[PDB]
Structures are given as structure tokens and as C-alpha cells.
Ligand binder design. Structure first.
Ligand SMILES: O=[N+]([O-])c1ccc(O)cc1
Lengths: 315, 314
């Protein structure tokens, strides 16, 4: 694959580091790898941060980080954010710069759902936590000082899986109302033999054996993976129709590319207004990784998402 | 798979044979597109000045200068090269698109009304395009623009012109260009590549149409591999040092692959390239009024507008 030069340099750095493959590690080891990779010094938007817990979801409690453009005490539209990193990894640290950018560019409060990770928690704990926080935000707008009629959901990778599943759950349960949804390179299927899985089975960055491992951490052995709450590519027209306008951003060189774009087609053919954009020359995780933060694809996609959300939440 | 409104537009054309635009005279084709780009559509408000610059290989180039309505400041400036196959296109067909770019970029925009084919041939239009870009850089007080914040942009054959103007500026020592924007550019003349084969019979743009357009543009017998004709053939040294570029392609477009391949060449020559493919849409999707409310059109215009705003005011 022809990668943007800085992105190629990163990939070269990686294969020259000779590390062990992420899926040979323990969950705690894998968490620390990504946390350390994202611990470098890098400029970030100025925000006010409140870490707390909402007494909602199937475990009885869900940890959340609430972010707002620094010094802004107005009643703001709100983004509920579901982070990625394979269900196993990711935290408020790994995704900090990305979600700050979304909060400030959208001029919105952002509620980061620090959901229970896998394999300690399997399907469906996280998606139900995610749904419960989204409902909580919609129902406690005075307590959060947000406008619940301008509520967006967004996520990256497995977090894009959660975005689509929260949209589906909200359709089935009659709410809450969602203004717009943003999905960065979402996981939507478990077909490890499709076009982009084949083309990028060995990378860069994300591999087919890693996806196999991640799915196995997320799901109990033997469950039917075609359920749309697991692989939303299988959602019916009636489950997709009526959902909020969506922005789907894919990476050209990513095993997940084809399923993300196929899901966007399914949404569009159900009558949903879908903005779908492939960024050439970049890789999986390109709006999260600090090392790619100055590449044209990262800058362009974060700017596109931020402007999409600002228009949705303030237009 | 096409976005539903886009599909509906294509289905409205099912009796047109492509459209078989290449079966018409140049004047008839021009009127077909001009009519298609009439109707009802919202557009941003701009001030307009139609004039002629005494420049280019024929001694005169017609231009339309626009600015956000009522804005008297010294603005950054976009020089814009319109598409529609060298044969068609005018201030009317591209009006909504260039108004959006001007207002979203908060910039003056100089619309080059270059001599169209087959009345004019290569290289008249590209030399007019380069001459106007130079003229703008050198007459900034007359035009009330900031020539240190100058971008070039174009769609389709206008994207071909953008690439060629960038190259000519490299060869001739200027003017300096801050950014360049290329919507689904023409960069090659390989009618057997992947997207040409996949979309040979449409939608909207067909292989026979491209054959016709190229034949209207070029004198018989010229080597089409020259980079001032097919900039996909530009050397690393011709591409290196060019201004950062935004290249936007449509998924369902014979020209998709050459646009994306040209973005790759620019990127490997060290140019900072933002390259994005919009799925569900077709060739011409940021110009056509009938698609102006589709998500791809809205997204690509908002992206280009913000990219230009950042380049010219950052
Ligand atoms: O007006 N028309 O039918 C057209 C115009 C332009 C084009 O590229 C194809 C068909």
C-alpha cells in the first residue's frame, strides 16, 4: 500500500521495533501498550474536565468523563462518545486529544463513556452501558447543563460498532432522539474473508489475527455473530430507517474499510442521510493516534467530523 | 450503489443514452448543461464584477471576480478553473459552487472564463489560466486581494488545469501558491484503467464522452503523455515543491482512479496531500444543482470550503 510518508515512517518504525503482536499479551499488558503509545507530549485543545459516575447501565454504574470547551458554562449541545481499541484497550488517556478536538470543534459538551472492557466484560455489557448513558444524558439535561434536543453520538472502531448499535437500540426502545451520529472506521461485520480483510490481513497496524482475537475477547464462544446488535451490517431496513444522519469515515488501508463502507450503503438505502468518505493514504486508527496527528488525513478527517457535528448541533 | 436522490437523477436520464452528450454540437451541449443548471437553488450572496484581463496567448482572458457580498477588505484570493469537458461550462453552470467556495473560504474568487473547445485547442486554456493566476498575483492592489494568500482550484478538466498551473508556476518561477483544490480531476487519458472500465457506460460521464472531449481539446497527433496534458506523467521534480493539495474524488466515476493516482504521485513527491473519496456519488457532484442537497455534495463543498479557509486565513 502507498501510505502518506509520515504514516509510512510510523509503520516502518513499527516493523523495525520487533515487538510481540498485541494479541499475545494479557488484557492489562495490551492496555498499557496503547496507553504508553499515547502518553507522548502533544498540544491539545483547552477543556474543562469532570470525571464522575452515572448510576445507570447493567452493572449499576458507568464511569464517564465530561469534557467542555474551557470556561464555557453555557447550555451546550452534547456528544456521547464511545471509544475504540478492540474492546480490550482504550481509556480517557488514549483518546484524549481526539475527543477534545471534537468537543471544541463542535462547541459541545462531550460525555466519554468509560465502558467496561473485555474480556472481563463481554457483550452486551458495554453497548448497554453506552445506551444507558445516552438515555441518562437525554433525561438529565438540567443536571448536565446541556440541550438534549441537540444530542449526537460518535465513536471510533469498536466505538463505531457501539455508535451503530446505540442507534439501533434507540430505534427499538423509542428513544432517546439522536440528532446525528459519527462513525470513524467502524467495526460492523465479522467476515474475516472480505475484500479489505484479505488485502490488509497482515497490516498495516491492524491485522486479521488481531481482529479474530478482539472479537473472541468481546464475545462468548458460540454466540450467533449475525445478530445486528453485534454486527450491525445485518440490521434490517426497519431497524436502520429513521436513524439520525450519519457521517462514516473510512481509511483506505484498513481491514475494516469494506465493512464500514458496506454499512454506510445499507444505511443510505434505508433512507438515512449518510455522508461517507474514504481517506486515501492512511491506516486504521488514524484520528486517534498521536503519531499521525499532523498527517493530512488525520487533520482532514477530524476537521470534517468537527464541522459535521457543529452544523448538526448548532445549525 | 448510488445515494437515492442521485440514483433518481440518473434514472431521469434513462432515455438519454449516457447521456449521449457527444452526439450534439458544442453549442447544443453548452445549452443542455446551462439548462440543467437553471431551476431553483439557494446560493450564497456575492458581489460580481465581469471584466477582461489583457493577458494570455490570445491577448485577452474573460474573468468574473466575486467576493462575499458587501466585503470591502483586502481578501485572500482563489483563482478558479471550471470543468465540463473543455466544451461546456460557463459562469452560470458553476455559479453556486464557486459562490460557496468564495463565501466559505472568505476569499475573492477569480473565475477564468477560458476559451472553450473545439473553437480553442490546447494549450490556449492552460496558458490563459496561468496568465490570469500570474496577473492576480501581480495586480493585487487593483483587485484588493492579498497575493501572499492565493489558492487555485478547479473541477474535472478544471482540475487538470489546476495541476497544470501548479506545474507551470514551478517551471516559470512563480507565482507562489498557498493551496490547490482539485475536484475529480482529469489527469490521464488511459481509457482502459479500472474505473474507466467499471463506469464506461455511466453514470452521467461515459467513456465515449471522454473520448469526444479529449478529441475536441487536443489537435490531432499530439503526444498525450506530456505532463501539461496528462499531469499524471509529471516528474517528481515537477511535483515537488508544489502547494498543499486537496483532491476529492467520486466513487462512481470513470475519472476516480486517475484522480487518486495523481494524489499519490503528489504525495510521494513530498507534497502535503489531503485525498478523500466520497462514496455513493457521481462525477460532477459538487457542481450539479440537482445534487446540491445530497450528503456527498454538501460534505465535499464544506470540506473544500474549510480547507481553503484554513489555508488562506490560518
Ligand atoms: O449535459 N450532459 O448530458 C452531460 C454533461 C457533462 C457530462 O460530463 C456528461 C453529460
Amino acid at each position: 500500500p502507498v501510505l502518506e510518508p509520515t504514516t509510512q515512517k510510523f509503520i516502518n518504525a513499527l516493523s523495525a521495533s520487533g515487538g510481540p503482536a498485541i494479541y499475545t499479551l494479557t488484557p492489562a499488558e495490551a492496555r498499557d501498550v496503547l496507553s504508553g503509545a499515547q502518553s507522548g507530549e502533544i498540544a491539545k485543545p483547552a477543556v474543562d474536565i469532570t470525571d464522575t459516575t452515572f448510576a445507570v447501565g447493567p452493572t449499576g454504574a458507568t464511569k464517564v468523563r465530561i469534557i467542555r470547551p474551557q470556561g464555557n458554562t453555557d447550555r451546550l449541545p452534547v456528544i456521547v462518545y464511545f471509544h475504540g481499541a478492540g474492546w480490550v484497550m482504550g481509556d480517557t488517556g488514549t483518546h484524549d486529544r481526539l475527543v477534545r478536538e471534537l468537543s471544541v470543534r463542535a462547541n459541545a459538551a462531550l460525555v466519554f463513556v468509560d465502558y467496561e472492557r473485555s474480556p472481563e466484560a463481554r457483550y452486551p455489557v458495554a453497548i448497554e452501558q453506552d445506551y444507558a448513558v445516552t438515555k441518562y444524558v437525554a433525561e438529565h439535561s438540567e443536571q448536565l447543563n446541556v440541550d438534549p434536543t441537540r444530542l449526537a453520538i460518535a465513536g471510533d472502531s469498536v466505538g463505531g460498532n457501539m455508535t451503530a448499535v446505540v442507534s439501533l437500540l434507540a430505534q427499538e426502545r423509542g428513544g432517546p432522539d439522536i440528532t446525528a451520529q459519527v462513525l470513524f472506521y467502524p467495526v460492523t461485520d465479522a467476515d474475516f474473508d472480505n475484500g479489505s480483510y484479505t488485502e490488509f490481513a497482515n497490516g498495516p497496524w491492524l491485522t486479521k489475527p488481531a481482529m479474530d482475537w478482539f472479537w473472541n475477547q468481546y464475545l462468548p464462544e458460540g454466540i450467533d455473530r449475525t445478530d445486528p446488535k453485534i454486527t450491525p451490517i445485518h440490521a434490517t431496513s426497519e431497524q436502520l430507517s429513521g436513524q439520525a444522519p450519519a457521517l462514516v469515515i473510512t481509511a483506505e488501508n484498513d481491514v475494516l474499510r469494506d465493512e464500514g463502507e458496506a454499512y454506510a450503503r445499507k444505511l443510505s438505502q434505508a433512507g438515512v442521510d449518510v455522508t461517507v468518505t474514504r481517506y486515501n493514504g492512511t491506516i486504521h486508527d488514524f484520528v486517534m493516534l498521536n503519531v499521525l496527528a499532523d498527517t493530512p488525513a488525520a487533520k482532514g478527517a477530524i476537521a470534517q467530523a468537527g464541522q459535521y457535528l457543529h452544523t448538526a448541533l448548532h445549525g
